[PDB]
Design a protein around this ligand. Structure first.
Ligand SMILES: Nc1ncnc2c1ncn2[C@@H]1O[C@H](CSCC[C@H](N)C(=O)O)[C@@H](O)[C@H]1O
Ligand SMILES: Nc1ncnc2c1ncn2[C@@H]1O[C@H](CSCC[C@H](N)C(=O)O)[C@@H](O)[C@H]1O
Ligand SMILES: Nc1ncnc2c1ncn2[C@@H]1O[C@H](CSCC[C@H](N)C(=O)O)[C@@H](O)[C@H]1O
Ligand SMILES: C[n+]1cn([C@@H]2O[C@H](COP(=O)(O)O)[C@@H](O)[C@H]2O)c2nc(N)[nH]c(=O)c21
Ligand SMILES: C[n+]1cn([C@@H]2O[C@H](COP(=O)(O)O)[C@@H](O)[C@H]2O)c2nc(N)[nH]c(=O)c21
Ligand SMILES: C[n+]1cn([C@@H]2O[C@H](COP(=O)(O)O)[C@@H](O)[C@H]2O)c2nc(N)[nH]c(=O)c21
Ligand SMILES: [Zn+2]
Ligand SMILES: [Zn+2]
Ligand SMILES: [Zn+2]
Lengths: 453, 453, 453
């Protein structure tokens, strides 16, 4: 009845975990010095909660599975494992090892059936079995009614969901990092509670952001290159660092999971679908999606995010490979600090004074990580200034002057305070939806040898 | 005898709930991290109180019902469910699932009768049964004497009430958000105790209101567009955000439920009707309506609101898509803070000093939400100024000078203090009152399969 | 079940050791005054943890072994010992002595088998035995599935790993000093928690770095030499001092162990490999490597380091053999000190004031070693200055001016704060991979005499 997580007993993250999962009873039990422990604990609790929601006798598709995680579960999983990633052969070997080690000692689980299914798949690679197969999300043929996506960032969401729906699935879950900073189109950012940093490929040679590296120079003035760059804009390629584990990602596929509250899937068959956010903790979320046959209602095309902690986006100046430039950066701020800055921001404050005030509030133990304090101090200072400029240039009610052109004002900070909401316009009507094994003989031989014993 | 609500045991909202429902005994029992928990708790208690008022042996029409909420009740409900919303098929499937799960375990409730009625409706979609039907409020033919509207914003109130009255209904209840801010014709606003924000569609690209989103710019002066806008006025389309759930609404239909204390319905038959407010809690209300055959008395056409907390409407300046404009905003303020500002407002005070005083009063735990403090500080500052201008320009008693024209003074704030009343002029004489299933074969097949087992 | 380490009972390093190995229970038991005790304790615990991971019945290759360390172990080691180092004959004699001393007193270990294997190898020097051989990593022919490298810096990593893989090894471990400072290309540096200093061969006659020596002079101005040096750049030869033990090293071979997260080995057979960091303590690390047959996925060529303590690289001025020059130096800083300097660095601070503040923070017992304090104080002072220069020269968003050349700014400090990550670009596709005993008759005779008794 208790749930055990692998974190230190004196961690501050434990209270946030307890507030996010009020239906459980959370115990710390540390066994390793993992440098991304908080992220793993959140994923573990999310799987527990999802299993508690649904009822047994239903079969669950596990898209992009890691089979060894599902091996001591009593529910009915069908693991979809294509070998498209360099980490997959080791996961498969680990599954076979775990299976062979406990073959008679454990009896409640369908251990023998799992061994037989794996052997049958190794013999002929194009066969479906109740617990395993080697197809993709589009080419699997097992029928079910629940689908799960755990830390899956590599598929286009509407195509995948349509292919699950034409097979009888009515309910789906998605677990992962919040997609909001990519809808605002930032160049780099942080998830500080999870020791995670990310950056665009064009700024990996910066100096003072979370994920970067550069070197010492004396500063020659020449650097004469005829190739005129002249624009610094975000591109599709992004790099993620979770603790010390590296993952590359694509901006398009990340944006495709920022789904509106109502949408329609219109193909040979038609469906009406909804998406809600049911767990949200300092930048990690769980989403629940339902799908129904036929067309009902109408769509607006709006997606909403609720901010429990503060969210910040701002302009910063740095050197990239020695050349001075400006670009945008985003982060999260705890609610108590935001509440304690309300009085200060009524006036104009310099960045240095803001930094001293924030250090005073923080270190009274650390509420927030120190390496983000200088950028936050700068953002708060610009926001406070811009507000004053609005108060000194009043307009007339009900009137929009355009004498025959109007000017845009400059904006250097966006600041979403606790208990406010973001709203963005996205696509809501989808009509367009458009095989070889990939295994190799030596790996098959290794698995067969490791199993047949 | 206790009533259990899904909120945290240390919440401040519990005392307000206890004061609003003095006839019950309210216990906190938290099971989920719902981000709009307070609104759900208020609706739950409202249904309990309404059921305690009326007597059994009467049949209750449930307009726009969600049937699974009425399934474990001992009273006699007739649920009117047309499938006009994208959320409806999932509600129907959930009802059928709940019914099938507990088919012999629960015996007191008319479980078997409900199953039979649902099956009979699925067979032929144009039949009335004692517990269910697929018609609208105008085309249902079941006769009753009580009607209930729970969070229903999609109908025109006098037409709907007339169609209920010609069928023998004598008493009706309405539960929902207070309609007063839409009678004052504001452009955006907040219900802060319920984590709720709303906005006109024309200002969704603002920067510093509750529900909005914008981006960074350097401020080009060109933006040369020949299309002269030249007026910024409210329009019919509005967006509501309750926690993170989104709802679109129409201004006309919202205004139609702000009913006067006495009115007449004059058709083929005639009725005389009254409307009173019986519960009011920080912007959420319950209204009771009675109807009688024949015409009696006379009407004035006035509607009254009593303010227990302070109500504010004021002019603010912002940037929308980068262009600087002014428009009106409304909110609610707790009574103790209003009482503690009485001495300060005797003189002229700057907005910055007002903001510092409000922060001092608030954080001594938080009485009011911090993200509204800057706008409130501005409003109080303008009100205090305008009062002084009245005191320095006295007129003569009993005289209205119009030398041959008179000027209007500028007004930037309206402030209704605790224990005052608003009064507005509305229509009170109504004479004008003016079908296919909408279900689909695959959904019917799914429901039949899910039921027949 | 306790693990015993040879350190003083009042040492501060014990808490760091306990945090790095949370699965053990660490007891101090001092028996010698070793001046590099901390390094030996870390290596001991690393071997314990690795043995706990893997399962028995597997045979372990020990590359560049010291056999006497493996003599009282119950696992199955095959020690690869070529006599290429001046320390090797004494290690071999010590092994034979240890074996002969306990020949009947100890029975659980394969003592008799080990004696027989050593004698058989002495008779014919080109024979493999289950526990011993005299080949190199490339010319050994024993088959196994685990390989271990303990403090091995003399081989080129991809060639060695390929030769282990074509023999059936699937898992490998590497224990040693962190390779990050050599990827930044520094000229000298320190690992202060382990009493270790290192330097390039060209600066051994400096005055104020960790490892150096010089003499007194009155300063003649002549020193007329026609040989124009004119550049001071790092070269391949480096010297390491661990306590008072000296080791020479090569920069190329050290860099070759800074491996990316995914890579491919493409020869006659092909493999896909991964490298993760599983233990990290103040500059000492353990790396785990897996290899699989066949080609899967794709590579990026990036390597990542996670910083738990602060890392610093900076420019310094010294005299070398009496001539004044400048070059770069690197070190590590504890996290609490870094956190306590956050407020000070918002302004410009002189080096002297920084030094006084650091002395105040440190001596309140010593958190960090005093001989590094002057260089750290200088680095912090320059970093704080450079940040200000960025804040006073803002650019426009999204724009990279190159009017037709751009200038590089000067950078004198790189500072990686706690909870940030370094990222470097390295090679990830490897295709190119290209014997006499070396023992002598008198040594063989000595070993035979010492054994035959
Ligand atoms: N089109 C596709 N259909 C199904 N799986 C896919 C896919 N494309 C990539 N994948 C798989 O998705 C996985 C993402 S990483 C695996 C995450 C895993 N669910 C976990 O819990 O750790 C990869 O193994 C990759 O092989
Ligand atoms: N003209 C009409 N007559 C009856 N119901 C209507 C209607 N127009 C819309 N509705 C229904 O009113 C519902 C409003 S949302 C449902 C609210 C529900 N009573 C609850 O407690 O949660 C929708 O399901 C919609 O189908
Ligand atoms: N090509 C090679 N293959 C295997 N061992 C080698 C080698 N080149 C050098 N060595 C050996 O590697 C050793 C490094 S010093 C020995 C370290 C030892 N593992 C310990 O725990 O203390 C030397 O003894 C040297 O003989
Ligand atoms: C498979 N995957 C996992 N993560 C997260 O990174 C963590 C890695 O776990 P540590 O090895 O235990 C996991 O807990 C996941 O939360 C991942 N994060 C990103 N951005 N992309 C990925 O593909 C991905
Ligand atoms: C159906 N509906 C519900 N609400 C409120 O929003 C809450 C939604 O509940 P959470 O999912 O539990 C409910 O408690 C209602 O109070 C609603 N609010 C608006 N503005 N419009 C609606 O249609 C509507
Ligand atoms: C064999 N070797 C050992 N070390 C370290 O130096 C320590 C020497 O041990 P003391 O004699 O006990 C060991 O604990 C190792 O950590 C070593 N360090 C370097 N740079 N090069 C080496 O070859 C080397
Ligand atoms: Zn399948
Ligand atoms: Zn009906
Ligand atoms: Zn050998």
């Amino acid at each position: 009845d208790p749930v055990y997580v692998d974190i230190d007993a004196d961690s501050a993250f434990l209270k946030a975990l307890q507030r996010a999962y009020p239906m459980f009873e959370v115990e710390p039990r540390q066994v390793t010095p993992n440098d991304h422990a908080n992220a793993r604990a959140f994923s573990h609790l999310a799987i527990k909660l999802i299993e508690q929601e649904i009822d047994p006798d239903s079969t669950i598709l596990d898209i992009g599975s890691a089979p060894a995680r599902r091996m001591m579960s009593d529910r009915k999983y069908h693991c979809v494992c294509p070998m498209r990633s360099a980490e997959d052969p080791e996961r498969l070997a680990n599954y076979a090892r775990k299976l062979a080690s406990a073959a008679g000692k454990v009896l409640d689980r369908n251990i023998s059936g799992k061994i037989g299914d794996l052997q049958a798949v190794m013999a002929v690679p194009d066969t479906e079995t109740p617990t395993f197969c080697l197809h993709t999300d589009v080419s699997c043929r097992q029928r079910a009614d629940v689908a799960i996506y755990q830390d899956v960032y590599a598929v286009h969401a509407p195509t995948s969901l349509y292919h699950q729906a034409i097979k009888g699935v009515r309910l789906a879950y998605w677990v992962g990092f919040d997609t909001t900073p990519f809808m605002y189109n930032a160049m780099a950012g942080a998830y500080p509670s999870y020791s995670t940093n990310w950056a665009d490929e064009q700024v990996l040679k910066a100096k003072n952001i979370g994920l970067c590296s550069t070197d010492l120079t004396e500063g020659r003035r020449g650097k004469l290159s005829i190739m005129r760059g002249k624009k610094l804009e975000p591109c599709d390629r992004v790099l993620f660092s979770v603790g010390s584990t590296l993952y590359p990602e694509s901006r398009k596929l990340l944006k495709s999971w920022h789904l509106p509250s109502v949408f329609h899937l219109k193909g040979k068959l038609s469906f009406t679908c909804r998406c809600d956010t049911v767990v949200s903790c300092e930048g990690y979320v769980v989403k629940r999606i339902t799908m129904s046959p036929g067309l009902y209602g109408k769509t607006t095309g709006y997606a909403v995010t609720h901010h429990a902690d503060g969210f910040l986006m701002c302009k910063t100046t740095d050197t990239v490979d020695g050349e001075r430039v400006s670009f945008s950066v985003c982060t999260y701020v705890p609610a108590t600090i935001c509440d304690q800055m309300t009085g200060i921001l009524a006036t104009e404050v310099t960045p240095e004074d803001a930094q001293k005030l924030l250090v005073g509030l923080n270190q009274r133990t650390n509420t927030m990580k120190n390496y983000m304090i200088p950028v936050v101090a700068q953002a708060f200072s610009k926001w406070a200034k811009e507000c004053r400029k609005d108060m000194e240039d009043e307009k007339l009610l009900g009137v929009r002057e355009r004498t025959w052109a109007f000017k845009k004002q400059k904006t250097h900070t966006v600041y979403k305070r606790p208990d406010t909401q973001s709203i963005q316009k996205v696509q809501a009507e989808f009509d367009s939806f458009v095989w070889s094994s990939g295994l190799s003989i030596p790996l098959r031989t290794r698995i067969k040898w490791l199993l047949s014993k």
